Amino acid sequence: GSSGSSGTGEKPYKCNECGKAFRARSSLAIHQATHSGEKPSGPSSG
Ligand SMILES: [Zn+2]
């Protein structure tokens, strides 16, 4: 694995969906726009 630690690193925003941490809101939002998912046309996967 990895330590994923480079000097400073404050996690002001935390995604209550997976566990991601962004520096600002905009950064968090853009991501939250990936979780959305329903009525999938093609369950072939899973
Ligand atoms: Zn997330």
PDB file of N, CA, C and O and ligand atoms in Angstrom:
ATOM      1  N   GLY A   1       0.806  -1.207   0.000  1.00  0.00           N
ATOM      2  CA  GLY A   1       0.000   0.000   0.000  1.00  0.00           C
ATOM      3  C   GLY A   1       0.842   1.261   0.000  1.00  0.00           C
ATOM      4  O   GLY A   1       1.954   1.272  -0.529  1.00  0.00           O
ATOM      5  N   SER A   2       0.312   2.325   0.594  1.00  0.00           N
ATOM      6  CA  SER A   2       1.020   3.598   0.656  1.00  0.00           C
ATOM      7  C   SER A   2       0.546   4.426   1.846  1.00  0.00           C
ATOM      8  O   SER A   2      -0.560   4.232   2.350  1.00  0.00           O
ATOM      9  N   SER A   3       1.392   5.349   2.292  1.00  0.00           N
ATOM     10  CA  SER A   3       1.063   6.205   3.425  1.00  0.00           C
ATOM     11  C   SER A   3       0.228   7.401   2.978  1.00  0.00           C
ATOM     12  O   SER A   3      -0.552   7.953   3.753  1.00  0.00           O
ATOM     13  N   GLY A   4       0.399   7.797   1.720  1.00  0.00           N
ATOM     14  CA  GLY A   4      -0.345   8.926   1.190  1.00  0.00           C
ATOM     15  C   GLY A   4      -0.262  10.146   2.085  1.00  0.00           C
ATOM     16  O   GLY A   4      -1.279  10.762   2.403  1.00  0.00           O
ATOM     17  N   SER A   5       0.953  10.496   2.495  1.00  0.00           N
ATOM     18  CA  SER A   5       1.164  11.649   3.364  1.00  0.00           C
ATOM     19  C   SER A   5       2.280  12.537   2.826  1.00  0.00           C
ATOM     20  O   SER A   5       3.447  12.144   2.802  1.00  0.00           O
ATOM     21  N   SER A   6       1.914  13.740   2.392  1.00  0.00           N
ATOM     22  CA  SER A   6       2.883  14.684   1.849  1.00  0.00           C
ATOM     23  C   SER A   6       2.803  16.023   2.577  1.00  0.00           C
ATOM     24  O   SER A   6       1.990  16.880   2.237  1.00  0.00           O
ATOM     25  N   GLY A   7       3.656  16.194   3.584  1.00  0.00           N
ATOM     26  CA  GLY A   7       3.666  17.429   4.345  1.00  0.00           C
ATOM     27  C   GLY A   7       2.307  17.764   4.926  1.00  0.00           C
ATOM     28  O   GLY A   7       1.691  16.939   5.604  1.00  0.00           O
ATOM     29  N   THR A   8       1.835  18.978   4.663  1.00  0.00           N
ATOM     30  CA  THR A   8       0.541  19.422   5.167  1.00  0.00           C
ATOM     31  C   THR A   8      -0.601  18.740   4.422  1.00  0.00           C
ATOM     32  O   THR A   8      -0.426  18.258   3.305  1.00  0.00           O
ATOM     33  N   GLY A   9      -1.773  18.704   5.051  1.00  0.00           N
ATOM     34  CA  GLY A   9      -2.928  18.079   4.431  1.00  0.00           C
ATOM     35  C   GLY A   9      -4.167  18.164   5.299  1.00  0.00           C
ATOM     36  O   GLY A   9      -4.507  17.212   6.003  1.00  0.00           O
ATOM     37  N   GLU A  10      -4.845  19.307   5.251  1.00  0.00           N
ATOM     38  CA  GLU A  10      -6.053  19.512   6.042  1.00  0.00           C
ATOM     39  C   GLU A  10      -7.289  19.056   5.274  1.00  0.00           C
ATOM     40  O   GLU A  10      -7.459  19.379   4.098  1.00  0.00           O
ATOM     41  N   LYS A  11      -8.152  18.301   5.947  1.00  0.00           N
ATOM     42  CA  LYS A  11      -9.373  17.799   5.331  1.00  0.00           C
ATOM     43  C   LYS A  11     -10.596  18.533   5.872  1.00  0.00           C
ATOM     44  O   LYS A  11     -11.302  18.045   6.756  1.00  0.00           O
ATOM     45  N   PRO A  12     -10.856  19.732   5.331  1.00  0.00           N
ATOM     46  CA  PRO A  12     -11.996  20.557   5.743  1.00  0.00           C
ATOM     47  C   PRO A  12     -13.330  19.962   5.307  1.00  0.00           C
ATOM     48  O   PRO A  12     -14.316  20.019   6.041  1.00  0.00           O
ATOM     49  N   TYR A  13     -13.354  19.391   4.107  1.00  0.00           N
ATOM     50  CA  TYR A  13     -14.569  18.787   3.572  1.00  0.00           C
ATOM     51  C   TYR A  13     -14.435  17.269   3.498  1.00  0.00           C
ATOM     52  O   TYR A  13     -13.412  16.745   3.057  1.00  0.00           O
ATOM     53  N   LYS A  14     -15.477  16.568   3.931  1.00  0.00           N
ATOM     54  CA  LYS A  14     -15.480  15.110   3.914  1.00  0.00           C
ATOM     55  C   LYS A  14     -16.738  14.577   3.236  1.00  0.00           C
ATOM     56  O   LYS A  14     -17.855  14.957   3.591  1.00  0.00           O
ATOM     57  N   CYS A  15     -16.551  13.694   2.261  1.00  0.00           N
ATOM     58  CA  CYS A  15     -17.671  13.107   1.535  1.00  0.00           C
ATOM     59  C   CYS A  15     -18.341  12.014   2.361  1.00  0.00           C
ATOM     60  O   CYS A  15     -17.760  10.955   2.597  1.00  0.00           O
ATOM     61  N   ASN A  16     -19.569  12.278   2.798  1.00  0.00           N
ATOM     62  CA  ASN A  16     -20.319  11.317   3.598  1.00  0.00           C
ATOM     63  C   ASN A  16     -20.978  10.267   2.709  1.00  0.00           C
ATOM     64  O   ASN A  16     -22.124   9.879   2.937  1.00  0.00           O
ATOM     65  N   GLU A  17     -20.246   9.811   1.698  1.00  0.00           N
ATOM     66  CA  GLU A  17     -20.760   8.806   0.775  1.00  0.00           C
ATOM     67  C   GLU A  17     -19.747   7.683   0.574  1.00  0.00           C
ATOM     68  O   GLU A  17     -20.117   6.517   0.428  1.00  0.00           O
ATOM     69  N   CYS A  18     -18.468   8.042   0.566  1.00  0.00           N
ATOM     70  CA  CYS A  18     -17.400   7.067   0.381  1.00  0.00           C
ATOM     71  C   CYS A  18     -16.285   7.282   1.400  1.00  0.00           C
ATOM     72  O   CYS A  18     -15.849   6.344   2.065  1.00  0.00           O
ATOM     73  N   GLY A  19     -15.829   8.525   1.516  1.00  0.00           N
ATOM     74  CA  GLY A  19     -14.769   8.842   2.457  1.00  0.00           C
ATOM     75  C   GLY A  19     -13.686   9.705   1.840  1.00  0.00           C
ATOM     76  O   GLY A  19     -12.517   9.609   2.213  1.00  0.00           O
ATOM     77  N   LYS A  20     -14.074  10.550   0.890  1.00  0.00           N
ATOM     78  CA  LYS A  20     -13.128  11.434   0.219  1.00  0.00           C
ATOM     79  C   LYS A  20     -12.970  12.743   0.986  1.00  0.00           C
ATOM     80  O   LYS A  20     -13.850  13.136   1.750  1.00  0.00           O
ATOM     81  N   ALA A  21     -11.843  13.415   0.773  1.00  0.00           N
ATOM     82  CA  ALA A  21     -11.571  14.681   1.442  1.00  0.00           C
ATOM     83  C   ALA A  21     -11.044  15.719   0.457  1.00  0.00           C
ATOM     84  O   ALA A  21     -10.008  15.516  -0.178  1.00  0.00           O
ATOM     85  N   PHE A  22     -11.761  16.830   0.333  1.00  0.00           N
ATOM     86  CA  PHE A  22     -11.366  17.899  -0.576  1.00  0.00           C
ATOM     87  C   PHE A  22     -10.928  19.140   0.200  1.00  0.00           C
ATOM     88  O   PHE A  22     -11.103  19.217   1.416  1.00  0.00           O
ATOM     89  N   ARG A  23     -10.360  20.106  -0.514  1.00  0.00           N
ATOM     90  CA  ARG A  23      -9.896  21.340   0.107  1.00  0.00           C
ATOM     91  C   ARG A  23     -11.027  22.359   0.203  1.00  0.00           C
ATOM     92  O   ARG A  23     -11.129  23.099   1.182  1.00  0.00           O
ATOM     93  N   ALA A  24     -11.876  22.392  -0.820  1.00  0.00           N
ATOM     94  CA  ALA A  24     -13.001  23.319  -0.850  1.00  0.00           C
ATOM     95  C   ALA A  24     -14.292  22.601  -1.227  1.00  0.00           C
ATOM     96  O   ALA A  24     -14.284  21.411  -1.541  1.00  0.00           O
ATOM     97  N   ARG A  25     -15.401  23.334  -1.195  1.00  0.00           N
ATOM     98  CA  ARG A  25     -16.701  22.766  -1.532  1.00  0.00           C
ATOM     99  C   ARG A  25     -16.759  22.376  -3.006  1.00  0.00           C
ATOM    100  O   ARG A  25     -16.960  21.210  -3.343  1.00  0.00           O
ATOM    101  N   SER A  26     -16.580  23.362  -3.881  1.00  0.00           N
ATOM    102  CA  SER A  26     -16.615  23.123  -5.319  1.00  0.00           C
ATOM    103  C   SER A  26     -15.954  21.792  -5.665  1.00  0.00           C
ATOM    104  O   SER A  26     -16.482  21.011  -6.457  1.00  0.00           O
ATOM    105  N   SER A  27     -14.796  21.541  -5.065  1.00  0.00           N
ATOM    106  CA  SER A  27     -14.059  20.307  -5.312  1.00  0.00           C
ATOM    107  C   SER A  27     -14.861  19.094  -4.852  1.00  0.00           C
ATOM    108  O   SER A  27     -14.854  18.047  -5.501  1.00  0.00           O
ATOM    109  N   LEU A  28     -15.551  19.242  -3.727  1.00  0.00           N
ATOM    110  CA  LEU A  28     -16.360  18.159  -3.177  1.00  0.00           C
ATOM    111  C   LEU A  28     -17.608  17.928  -4.023  1.00  0.00           C
ATOM    112  O   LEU A  28     -17.967  16.789  -4.319  1.00  0.00           O
ATOM    113  N   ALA A  29     -18.264  19.018  -4.410  1.00  0.00           N
ATOM    114  CA  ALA A  29     -19.470  18.933  -5.225  1.00  0.00           C
ATOM    115  C   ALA A  29     -19.206  18.167  -6.517  1.00  0.00           C
ATOM    116  O   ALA A  29     -19.824  17.134  -6.773  1.00  0.00           O
ATOM    117  N   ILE A  30     -18.287  18.682  -7.328  1.00  0.00           N
ATOM    118  CA  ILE A  30     -17.943  18.045  -8.593  1.00  0.00           C
ATOM    119  C   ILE A  30     -17.887  16.528  -8.447  1.00  0.00           C
ATOM    120  O   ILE A  30     -18.306  15.793  -9.341  1.00  0.00           O
ATOM    121  N   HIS A  31     -17.368  16.066  -7.314  1.00  0.00           N
ATOM    122  CA  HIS A  31     -17.260  14.636  -7.049  1.00  0.00           C
ATOM    123  C   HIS A  31     -18.630  14.033  -6.755  1.00  0.00           C
ATOM    124  O   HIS A  31     -19.012  13.023  -7.347  1.00  0.00           O
ATOM    125  N   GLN A  32     -19.362  14.657  -5.839  1.00  0.00           N
ATOM    126  CA  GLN A  32     -20.688  14.179  -5.466  1.00  0.00           C
ATOM    127  C   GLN A  32     -21.547  13.937  -6.703  1.00  0.00           C
ATOM    128  O   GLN A  32     -22.549  13.224  -6.646  1.00  0.00           O
ATOM    129  N   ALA A  33     -21.148  14.535  -7.821  1.00  0.00           N
ATOM    130  CA  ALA A  33     -21.881  14.383  -9.072  1.00  0.00           C
ATOM    131  C   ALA A  33     -21.520  13.072  -9.762  1.00  0.00           C
ATOM    132  O   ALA A  33     -21.824  12.874 -10.939  1.00  0.00           O
ATOM    133  N   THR A  34     -20.869  12.178  -9.024  1.00  0.00           N
ATOM    134  CA  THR A  34     -20.465  10.887  -9.566  1.00  0.00           C
ATOM    135  C   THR A  34     -21.198   9.746  -8.870  1.00  0.00           C
ATOM    136  O   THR A  34     -21.422   8.688  -9.459  1.00  0.00           O
ATOM    137  N   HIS A  35     -21.569   9.966  -7.613  1.00  0.00           N
ATOM    138  CA  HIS A  35     -22.279   8.955  -6.836  1.00  0.00           C
ATOM    139  C   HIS A  35     -23.640   8.653  -7.454  1.00  0.00           C
ATOM    140  O   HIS A  35     -23.993   7.492  -7.662  1.00  0.00           O
ATOM    141  N   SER A  36     -24.400   9.703  -7.744  1.00  0.00           N
ATOM    142  CA  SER A  36     -25.725   9.548  -8.334  1.00  0.00           C
ATOM    143  C   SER A  36     -25.760   8.359  -9.288  1.00  0.00           C
ATOM    144  O   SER A  36     -24.904   8.224 -10.162  1.00  0.00           O
ATOM    145  N   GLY A  37     -26.757   7.497  -9.114  1.00  0.00           N
ATOM    146  CA  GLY A  37     -26.886   6.329  -9.966  1.00  0.00           C
ATOM    147  C   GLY A  37     -28.115   5.505  -9.638  1.00  0.00           C
ATOM    148  O   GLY A  37     -28.235   4.968  -8.537  1.00  0.00           O
ATOM    149  N   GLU A  38     -29.032   5.406 -10.596  1.00  0.00           N
ATOM    150  CA  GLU A  38     -30.259   4.643 -10.401  1.00  0.00           C
ATOM    151  C   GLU A  38     -30.866   4.238 -11.741  1.00  0.00           C
ATOM    152  O   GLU A  38     -30.504   4.776 -12.788  1.00  0.00           O
ATOM    153  N   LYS A  39     -31.791   3.285 -11.701  1.00  0.00           N
ATOM    154  CA  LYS A  39     -32.450   2.806 -12.911  1.00  0.00           C
ATOM    155  C   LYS A  39     -31.432   2.538 -14.015  1.00  0.00           C
ATOM    156  O   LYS A  39     -31.551   3.034 -15.136  1.00  0.00           O
ATOM    157  N   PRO A  40     -30.409   1.733 -13.695  1.00  0.00           N
ATOM    158  CA  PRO A  40     -29.352   1.378 -14.647  1.00  0.00           C
ATOM    159  C   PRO A  40     -29.855   0.461 -15.756  1.00  0.00           C
ATOM    160  O   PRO A  40     -30.461  -0.576 -15.488  1.00  0.00           O
ATOM    161  N   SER A  41     -29.598   0.849 -17.001  1.00  0.00           N
ATOM    162  CA  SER A  41     -30.028   0.062 -18.151  1.00  0.00           C
ATOM    163  C   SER A  41     -28.927  -0.894 -18.597  1.00  0.00           C
ATOM    164  O   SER A  41     -28.192  -0.615 -19.543  1.00  0.00           O
ATOM    165  N   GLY A  42     -28.818  -2.025 -17.906  1.00  0.00           N
ATOM    166  CA  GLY A  42     -27.803  -3.007 -18.245  1.00  0.00           C
ATOM    167  C   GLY A  42     -27.091  -3.549 -17.022  1.00  0.00           C
ATOM    168  O   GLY A  42     -25.929  -3.238 -16.765  1.00  0.00           O
ATOM    169  N   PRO A  43     -27.797  -4.382 -16.242  1.00  0.00           N
ATOM    170  CA  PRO A  43     -27.246  -4.986 -15.025  1.00  0.00           C
ATOM    171  C   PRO A  43     -26.172  -6.026 -15.331  1.00  0.00           C
ATOM    172  O   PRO A  43     -25.639  -6.665 -14.424  1.00  0.00           O
ATOM    173  N   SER A  44     -25.861  -6.190 -16.612  1.00  0.00           N
ATOM    174  CA  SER A  44     -24.853  -7.154 -17.037  1.00  0.00           C
ATOM    175  C   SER A  44     -23.693  -7.198 -16.047  1.00  0.00           C
ATOM    176  O   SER A  44     -23.068  -8.241 -15.852  1.00  0.00           O
ATOM    177  N   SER A  45     -23.410  -6.058 -15.426  1.00  0.00           N
ATOM    178  CA  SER A  45     -22.322  -5.964 -14.460  1.00  0.00           C
ATOM    179  C   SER A  45     -22.860  -5.981 -13.032  1.00  0.00           C
ATOM    180  O   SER A  45     -23.247  -4.946 -12.489  1.00  0.00           O
ATOM    181  N   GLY A  46     -22.882  -7.166 -12.428  1.00  0.00           N
ATOM    182  CA  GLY A  46     -23.376  -7.297 -11.070  1.00  0.00           C
ATOM    183  C   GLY A  46     -24.812  -7.776 -11.018  1.00  0.00           C
ATOM    184  O   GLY A  46     -25.309  -8.063  -9.930  1.00  0.00           O
TER     185      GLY A  46
HETATM  186 ZN    ZN B   1     -17.773  10.283  -2.338  1.00  0.00          ZN
END
